[PDB]
Design a protein around this ligand. Structure first.
Ligand SMILES: *[C@@H]1O[C@H](CO)[C@@H](O[C@@H]2O[C@H](CO)[C@@H](O[C@@H]3O[C@H](CO[C@H]4O[C@H](CO)[C@@H](O)[C@H](O)[C@@H]4O)[C@@H](O)[C@H](O[C@H]4O[C@H](CO)[C@@H](O)[C@H](O)[C@@H]4O)[C@@H]3O)[C@H](O)[C@H]2NC(C)=O)[C@H](O)[C@H]1NC(C)=O
Ligand SMILES: Nc1nc(=O)c2ncn([C@@H]3O[C@H](CO[P@](=O)(S)O[C@H]4[C@@H](O)[C@H](n5ccc(=O)[nH]c5=O)O[C@@H]4COP(=O)(O)S)[C@@H](OP(=O)(O)S)[C@H]3O)c2[nH]1
Ligand SMILES: Nc1nc(=O)c2ncn([C@@H]3O[C@H](CO[P@](=O)(S)O[C@H]4[C@@H](O)[C@H](n5ccc(=O)[nH]c5=O)O[C@@H]4COP(=O)(O)S)[C@@H](OP(=O)(O)S)[C@H]3O)c2[nH]1
Ligand SMILES: *[C@@H]1O[C@H](CO)[C@@H](O[C@@H]2O[C@H](CO)[C@@H](O[C@@H]3O[C@H](CO)[C@@H](O)[C@H](O)[C@@H]3O)[C@H](O)[C@H]2NC(C)=O)[C@H](O)[C@H]1NC(C)=O
Ligand SMILES: *[C@@H]1O[C@H](CO)[C@@H](O[C@@H]2O[C@H](CO)[C@@H](O)[C@H](O)[C@H]2NC(C)=O)[C@H](O)[C@H]1NC(C)=O
Ligand SMILES: *[C@@H]1O[C@H](CO)[C@@H](O[C@@H]2O[C@H](CO)[C@@H](O)[C@H](O)[C@H]2NC(C)=O)[C@H](O)[C@H]1NC(C)=O
Ligand SMILES: *[C@@H]1O[C@H](CO)[C@@H](O[C@@H]2O[C@H](CO)[C@@H](O)[C@H](O)[C@H]2NC(C)=O)[C@H](O)[C@H]1NC(C)=O
Ligand SMILES: *[C@@H]1O[C@H](CO)[C@@H](O[C@@H]2O[C@H](CO)[C@@H](O)[C@H](O)[C@H]2NC(C)=O)[C@H](O)[C@H]1NC(C)=O
Ligand SMILES: O=c1ccn([C@@H]2O[C@H](CO)[C@H]3O[P@@](O)(=S)O[C@H]32)c(=O)[nH]1
Ligand SMILES: O=c1ccn([C@@H]2O[C@H](CO)[C@H]3O[P@@](O)(=S)O[C@H]32)c(=O)[nH]1
Ligand SMILES: O=c1ccn([C@@H]2O[C@H](CO)[C@@H](O)[C@H]2O)c(=O)[nH]1
Ligand SMILES: O=c1ccn([C@@H]2O[C@H](CO)[C@@H](O)[C@H]2O)c(=O)[nH]1
Ligand SMILES: *[C@@H]1O[C@H](CO)[C@@H](O)[C@H](O)[C@H]1NC(C)=O
Ligand SMILES: *[C@@H]1O[C@H](CO)[C@@H](O)[C@H](O)[C@H]1NC(C)=O
Lengths: 749, 752
């Protein structure tokens, strides 16, 4: 049973974020990858990894987590060391004496302003070399020095990244092995014919935002003089015949020279965000040169203090015959008409159109019907209404790279996202002349309307509907009923009316749904309903009811809601978290559907739990009671369930295990008793006729009496290595003084 | 130094002993105490032994005992050896009967929220001096309880009785034989269908009659609700209120009335407050004779009389409302209608003293705003919650049919005429939204999801607004002339407008703030501010108070960015600054130095500070209150006197201090209040118990530290004794964590 790391065989040591002060000397000799990131290690030497001949990969990022002193040659003994991560270590230099066998090296986020032959030039086997984010913004730092030719002997080098450093010029003498070159925010005004002359394997070039566009910069920003654009020689991309990805975001471009692409038949992604291209978008000569381009991003090229009626799309857009996705965030314009998008209407594989954050007031939705293959129409964040460093160095810096539309919703077919607009009611013609929509986001439109069953009738086949974060008035039992095919309904965060006792709250419409699988009513502050107190569906499988008031619905002096979920006959998953529950009436619990496999009652205030009621739940596999105020467990749990597979009990107040407990239920694989009040686990808790089938048991955060008693448990652990127990460095002694703070595992008996 | 209670002087002498986990009435109460609060403890028995030595007790509260975070067993005559007892509170103890042997001296008795179903002479009759008697909420809703048996003439003895509450019990009949001493009588939700001419004859002095909730209106009830068969309205006899000439307040809410007998009011022309909510009175409102019997009426509530499911065009208001010359306040919630025109409120236009008109929750889509001008004296126009566009659920001491909080927050209303349009759908302010308004001094537009770019002209029609609530919207701050038309503006709330602030790519312009000559208070909380456009500093010569909690100073003041290092400095007149919840782990020295030197008050609570530069307090010579609660501080400076002469309150609750520096708590004279509760202190040594020079130290909080209880403490325990003028609250909760013997008990309760 490994300590202090958790070790797995596929053979890896997860030893991260564990409060270590030096490399542990108890690390298995079999290990090949070792992750010590986010620890407190302050020194590395030849002694540090002396045990571990077979080390292939070492991760030392973010040490000490709140300088890392590395010796000359400290790693030289490691002969299979292929990969080395030293990010966020405040290194003043590239450590000396690094082993010849390295293929990956990351020195991101340090204080290295000098890139030397001494340090690098003998590392011939390097595939990827990461040096970014060492001098940037108003960080107090020197300009970056790059010894002439230092990269010349890296003849296997495929990736080199020097971004967010002050370079001023493309370093010379780059090896032609290069696949990817990252030079973003490197302060490089001018690119010349020589700079990339013999790099005929390059697939990725990144030159954003040298000559950045600084208006409204979310970071310290310094433009080229004037507001000049980056200056790229006419012949700078001549021999770049393999380029797939070109990033020119925030280089203040106004013209785009078509001839840059003369020899670029494979260009697939072209990123031009945060430039000044409104002219070029209206007039795009360069579009001719890109009939194989899949992704084009012209986001944020708005002219500040200009908000024209219409977007102006060149006819030459019609040449982009391979375009799957077009991104136009932040063009900023008032009105979208059908004629405005003519030039895109014939693009055979144009699948995604993204118009977020354009402050668009009026759209002509029939526009979208005259398109071949549109799967995702993204219009979030407009003005449609009724008719310890700030930035992640491993992410894109000019856009978010989450999916535009949740996968679970887009899987269903064509999607239209109108979220974060001001559609405060859906008129009779809001959705007229739309394509046949299967997935529809209307979240956060502050919609207050009474839905009656005709509002979604120009688009009857929506299968997934996001209605979250509105203020809907549920005063009609035929609401949403036109959507026969509906499978998923999100009504979370619509509490506005639900809070008000005296208005009507009608939830009857749930039942008129043949195929409805998942319903989310979370955070609606439900405490009263009108007429029909019960939820009912023959199909529903999942109901989330967290963030409501079951404490009030099931108050002792009220009987009306005692069967509120019983009519959910098919139900397997039910979430009752965050309902301020101090106790559930035995009858209301017994009225929970017998079909359940998954029950969550976490983050309430439960003081007792009638375990004996688990007799009526024969399919029940997971029971989650984390974050309540529980004091004890039944001493005969197998009398009550035969199905329970996971039991979650973190953050309760259990101080004692019943005799026999955890040899009680054969079916239990995962038992979680973290952050409770156990001082020991008596010999009696361990006696057993049945061999256990328990594979994971969590005990961290309990106040263990570390003295002679716990020996019997230590043996049990030793005599049950199949039972995994994570966070051993956090299964800690509270007593006594001597053992205070140490893992219960590190004491002699 | 009293234990376990807090004994105060206020003349009186009262002991607060509530919510203290007490299993039994403590015997360590100082035997000269007037009033004892023992509520919310875990006390299980009272006997004549409980209070033996406490003669001069005039008051005991034992509410919610034994209040599991079964019942309170009380023996007969337990209280009798207490001669002076006046007021006794035994609310919410699960009592099965009124206890026997109550002192004759009692004026006030409360038995609210119990299981007492039988009223008896053996309990009540011998209590001659009773002014007030509270027996409500023993049998209601779907509780398992028996009907409520009132022994005949059980109240007839109590000739001094002013107030009797029997509400929320099944009575069925208003008990006969009531003393004529009664001023106020409460029989709400008592199941009393019929009121005879004989039920209130004896009672010539009634100021208050509560008959609400009898034959309740049950549609959409938020409680269990049994209508009367029919469902009939309550039946009140023509001559039921014949002898009730002294009556001031009448509550007939939720009695399913459809018609009101005009002559119910013949002999009460001093009726002041008429509560008629949750009935069926839409007809009576359109044509109502009873409206001419209320010449001295001040408050009329006709809320929630909508007919399901009418959504009529208009409200129909009888011409007879105009004979309500004394009316100060008309509440008309939940009538539910679509439109309001001027001609709809004519009968109200001529009333001299009508200051408040409440139309909340009427799903109103349109309003002719000009109609609020042929009014004389409107100070409050409450239109919140409409559709304008461009372990017992209920508090037994509150009104049950309405919230009683002020309609408009007082700080706002004191400025003058108020107009609350909160919770509507005004998602932009059009150019004519506010024409024909009076001179609005206080305007609430909260929660309208206003997403507009305010540009200096949207409030031209009501330019004298001094308190502007724009919280909970999604304002787009893309114009530096936003709001500048409101010259006189004094308070601006823009909390919870983080929608566009979240989005880095759009502009965020906060420049307008400097254009206000009298702006005193500005609230920018929970806007999630982390980036601003062109101008990076907030500026005002006026501003006294800036609330900036729930924003992102951790980003603004990031180490790799200089731009916002003087963000607050141009707030030259500032005294109160709130920087809480900004996710700060450190504050750059230059940034802290750049806070206004006029600050008397600074909160940096609920951030994540591991270190604080105490030396920097030398630049803040007026600073009286520094609040560093809810952070991760690991030590104090041992040199505090060196950095401040001015500091009175220091709040360090919830940190990780584990050693008090040497000579602390006597460094500074000005320091009255030090809060070190819930830290990691195991001991305090004499080092900090110099106690050199003179200190104004007055309160010192230490509850929640893990004190290790051995001789090492003795010095400090001695120190407590030697300075009693230093108040140390919650001694109960100043607990030993160590060692085993002393676990769980106060530090005060030890010895050699
Ligand atoms: C200018 O434009 C170019 C072209 O679009 C952008 O280039 C991309 O840059 C991003 C951001 O760095 C790159 O994304 C990163 O690549 C790694 C993926 O490599 C492969 O191998 C991994 C496993 O090693 C596979 O799982 C994966 O599927 C890939 O096949 C990721 O490791 C990165 O990390 C992610 O996860 C880890 C988990 O720990 C985290 O550390 C990260 O935060 C993140 O979650 C990351 O995905 C991307 O690959 C680049 N494109 C190409 C074609 O190479 C430029 O970034 C852009 N420049 C700027 C400044 O915006
Ligand atoms: N360009 C862009 N602008 C946006 O505004 C935007 N908003 C969300 N996104 C999403 O961000 C994601 C990242 O796209 P991008 O930044 S243009 O990165 C390039 C590449 O850098 C990236 N990529 C490609 C290969 C790879 O190995 N690693 C990798 O990260 O995927 C993209 C093209 O891949 P491809 O070669 O299959 S044609 C894309 O989605 P997925 O394809 O689901 S990962 C976008 O949908 C945006 N992308
Ligand atoms: N009736 C009504 N309908 C509402 O919709 C509403 N919303 C808020 N409120 C507030 O509820 C509050 C309570 O009013 P109400 O339920 S009508 O109770 C009566 C009385 O029960 C109550 N009162 C009177 C005297 C007293 O000593 N104590 C006391 O509580 O004050 C009120 C007037 O008495 P008065 O003789 O001063 S004209 C009032 O606030 P105040 O500013 O205190 S007058 C209302 O403004 C509403 N009241
Ligand atoms: C029916 O309407 C009547 C008349 O307004 C309501 O009477 C009011 O009831 C409240 C709640 O008990 C009283 O307020 C309380 O007063 C005590 C004594 O000062 C105070 O300690 C509490 O904190 C609270 O403010 C109020 O005084 C009373 N009105 C009068 C004139 O006494 C009655 O409650 C209504 N019935 C229901 C069921 O809502
Ligand atoms: C509907 O729109 C909202 C807002 O655009 C989406 O909510 C975001 O979801 C992401 C990823 O799940 C979260 O991390 C963000 O916090 C959310 N933002 C906000 C403002 O809520 C939601 O995902 C969209 N729904 C679907 C089905 O695509
Ligand atoms: C409302 O409920 C569902 C929970 O069922 C949420 O969607 C699921 O989220 C989990 C991640 O929490 C995914 O692994 C599932 O794939 C999701 N299911 C579906 C159908 O998408 C949903 O996010 C919740 N909504 C909000 C606003 O919290
Ligand atoms: C403006 O309207 C809002 C909402 O109607 C008021 O907010 C309420 O304020 C009271 C007192 O602070 C709170 O107890 C309620 O919970 C609040 N509700 C909500 C939804 O915020 C606000 O106080 C009003 N402002 C003024 C100046 O009167
Ligand atoms: C915005 O901040 C203001 C000023 O701090 C808050 O108003 C005051 O709050 C305290 C109690 O919190 C009162 O004692 C003062 O009467 C109030 N000052 C006023 C009204 O000027 C206000 O509550 C904050 N707004 C929100 C939504 O939190
Ligand atoms: O019978 C009742 C009693 C109270 N209420 C509502 O409960 C709340 C607390 O009294 C009040 O809020 P409202 O203004 S929506 O009406 C009252 C009812 O709607 N019906
Ligand atoms: O120079 C920049 C880079 C990114 N951005 C915005 O920051 C976020 C992180 O990349 C992104 O969110 P947006 O879609 S508003 O645009 C990006 C800028 O506004 N300016
Ligand atoms: O938007 C509206 C308009 C009217 N009503 C009415 O309000 C009453 C109580 O909410 C119901 O009978 C219903 O007719 C609403 O609920 N919502
Ligand atoms: O509602 C609107 C309309 C237009 N813009 C413009 O969008 C750009 C970026 O926010 C700015 O120049 C601003 O004028 C807005 O910000 N908000
Ligand atoms: C029960 O759930 C299954 C799986 O989601 C589903 O196929 C079936 O339709 C549901 N039962 C009913 C009666 O709809
Ligand atoms: C400074 O604040 C006070 C109120 O605290 C006020 O009298 C004065 O007007 C303010 N200063 C200026 C320049 O307005």
């Amino acid at each position: 049973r490994s300590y202090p790391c958790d070790e797995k065989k596929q053979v890896i040591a997860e030893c991260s974020n564990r409060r270590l002060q030096e490399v542990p000397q108890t690390v298995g000799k079999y290990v090949t990858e070792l992750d010590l990131s986010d620890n407190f290690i302050t020194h590395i030497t030849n002694e540090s990894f002396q045990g571990l001949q077979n080390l292939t990969k070492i991760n030392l990022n973010h040490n000490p987590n709140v300088g890392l002193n590395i010796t000359d040659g400290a790693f030289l003994n490691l002969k299979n060391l292929r990969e080395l991560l030293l990010e966020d270590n405040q290194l003043p230099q590239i450590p000396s004496g690094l082993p010849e066998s390295l293929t990956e090296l990351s020195l991101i986020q340090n204080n290295i302003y000098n890139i030397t032959k001494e340090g690098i030039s003998r590392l011939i086997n390097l595939k990827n070399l990461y040096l970014a984010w060492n001098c940037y913004f108003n960080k107090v730092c020197e300009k970056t020095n790059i010894e002439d030719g230092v990269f010349e002997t890296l003849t296997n080098l495929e990736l080199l990244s020097l971004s967010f450093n002050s370079l001023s010029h493309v370093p010379p003498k780059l090896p032609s092995s290069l696949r990817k070159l990252f030079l973003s925010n490197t302060q490089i005004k001018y690119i010349s014919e020589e700079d990339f002359k013999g790099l005929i394997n390059l697939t990725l070039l990144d030159l954003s935002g040298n000559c950045p566009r600084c208006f409204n910069a979310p970071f310290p920003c310094v433009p080229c003089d004037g507001g000049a654009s980056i200056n790229i020689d006419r012949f700078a991309f001549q021999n770049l015949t393999q380029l797939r990805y070109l990033n020119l975001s925030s280089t203040s471009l106004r013209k785009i020279n078509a001839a840059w692409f003369k020899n670029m038949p494979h260009l697939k992604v072209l990123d031009l965000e945060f430039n000044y291209l409104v002219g070029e978008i209206a007039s795009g000569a360069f579009l001719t040169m890109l009939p194989r381009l899949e992704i084009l991003d012209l986001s944020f090229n708005y002219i500040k203090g200009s908000y024209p009626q219409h977007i102006n799309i060149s006819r030459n857009f019609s040449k982009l015959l391979s375009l799957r996705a077009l991104h136009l965030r932040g063009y900023v314009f008032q009105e979208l008409r059908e004629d405005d998008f003519q030039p895109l209407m014939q693009l055979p594989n144009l699948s995604t159109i993204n118009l977020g954050i354009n402050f668009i007031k009026q759209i002509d939705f029939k526009l979208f019907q005259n398109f071949s293959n549109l799967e995702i129409i993204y219009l979030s964040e407009n003005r449609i209404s009724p008719l310890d460093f700030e930035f992640d160095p491993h992410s894109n810096f000019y856009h978010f790279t989450r999916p535009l539309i949740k996968p679970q919703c887009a899987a269903y077919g064509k999607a239209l996202d109108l979220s974060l607009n001001s559609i405060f009611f859906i008129g009779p013609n809001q959705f007229e002349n739309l394509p046949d929509i299967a997935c529809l986001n209307l979240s956060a439109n502050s919609n207050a309307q009474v839905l009656s069953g005709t509002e979604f009738s120009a688009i009857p086949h929506v299968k997934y509907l996001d209605l979250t974060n509105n203020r809907l008035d549920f005063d009609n039992a035929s609401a949403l009923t036109e959507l026969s095919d509906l499978e998923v309904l999100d009504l979370s965060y619509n509490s506005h009316y639900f809070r008000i006792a005296g208005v009507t709250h009608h939830l009857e419409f749930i039942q008129n749904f043949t195929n409805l699988k998942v319903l989310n009513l979370s955070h609606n502050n439900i405490y009263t309903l009108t007429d029909k107190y019960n939820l009912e569906s023959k199909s529903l499988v999942e109901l989330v009811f967290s963030g409501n008031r079951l404490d009030i619905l099931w108050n002792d002096d009220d009987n009306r809601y005692i069967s509120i979920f019983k009519g959910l006959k098919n139900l397997t998953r039910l979430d009752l978290s965050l309902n301020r529950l101090k106790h559930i009436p035995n009858e209301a619990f017994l009225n929970l559907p017998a079909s359940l496999t998954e029950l969550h009652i976490n983050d309430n205030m439960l003081k007792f739990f009638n375990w004996t009621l688990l007799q009526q739940f024969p399919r029940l596999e997971l029971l989650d009671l984390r974050g309540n105020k529980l004091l004890f467990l039944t001493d005969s749990l197998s009398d009550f369930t035969s199905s329970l597979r996971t039991l979650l009990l973190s953050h309760n107040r259990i101080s004692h295990l019943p005799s026999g407990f955890l040899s009680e239920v054969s079916s239990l694989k995962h038992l979680d008793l973290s952050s409770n009040l156990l001082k020991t686990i008596n010999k009696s808790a361990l006696e057993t006729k049945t061999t256990t089938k328990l594979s994971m048991l969590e005990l961290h955060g309990n106040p263990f009496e570390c003295t002679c008693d716990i020996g019997d448990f230590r043996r049990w652990m030793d005599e049950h290595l199949n039972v995994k127990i994570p966070r051993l460095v956090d299964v800690i002694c509270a007593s006594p003084g001597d053992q205070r703070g140490k893992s219960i595992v590190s004491l002699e008996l």
